[PDB]
Amino acid sequence: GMSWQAYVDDHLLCDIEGQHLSAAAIVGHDGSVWAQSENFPELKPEEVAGMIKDFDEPGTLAPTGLFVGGTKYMVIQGEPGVVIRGKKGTGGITIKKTGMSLIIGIYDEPMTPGQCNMVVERLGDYLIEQGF
């Protein structure tokens, strides 16, 4: 049967157009990690709360910055209540909200934001349809 580690390893860290995410995780809304990749940062307190806040009231994170594992990302265009996106240098991050989790993918060049978006958001949609 399926496991959260399997979803990370086989559905987030998988090859897309010859490129792979640098790291990924699936985390409960309450910050409890369901599964994560080897290099995925440990989350600092209130990082997850920021994301939840930003999903609930769109725009709040932008003046502040997006923090993940003590790394700061410039907020870029997301989708209100559904996806948060950020840039840092030639890399970035996508965070997609499901009914009870957050799907997080982190990429760096030569991976494109579109590729990261695609992988994280498509798994998100699948998980949402399953009730998660």
Author numbering: 0 to 131
What did the article's authors report about this structure?
The rHev b 8 and rZea m 12 crystals (5 mg/mL) were obtained using the conditions described in the materials and methods section. These crystals diffracted to resolutions of 1.9 and 2.2 Å, respectively, and belonged to the P43212 space group. A backbone alignment of the two 3D-structures reveals that they adopt the same conformation, with a root-mean-square-deviation (rmsd) of 0.27 Å. The sequence alignment shows that the principal differences are between residues 37ANFPQFKSEEITGIMSDFH55for rHev b 8 and 37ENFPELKPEEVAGMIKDFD55 for rZea m 12. These residues are structurally located in a region exposed to the solvent, mainly in the loop that connects β-strand 2 and α-helix 2, but some also belong to α-helix 2. The electrostatic potential surfaces of both structures display the most significant differences that lead to a more electronegative surface on rZea m 12. In general, the most important structural differences between rHev b 8 and rZea m 12 are the contributions of some side-chains that alter the surface charge, essentially at the loop that has been considered important for antibody recognition 262728 and it is exposed on the surface of the dimer structure. The assays showed that mAb 2F5 specifically recognizes monomeric rHev b 8, even at a low concentration (2 μg/mL); conversely, mAb 2F5 showed no reactivity towards monomeric rZea m 12, suggesting that this IgE recognizes a conformational epitope on the surface of rHev b 8 that is not shared with rZea m 12. From the immunological standpoint, it is relevant to note that mAb 2F5 only recognized rHev b 8, but not rZea m 12, even though the sequence identity is 79.4% and the folding is very similar (rmsd of 0.27 Å for Cα).
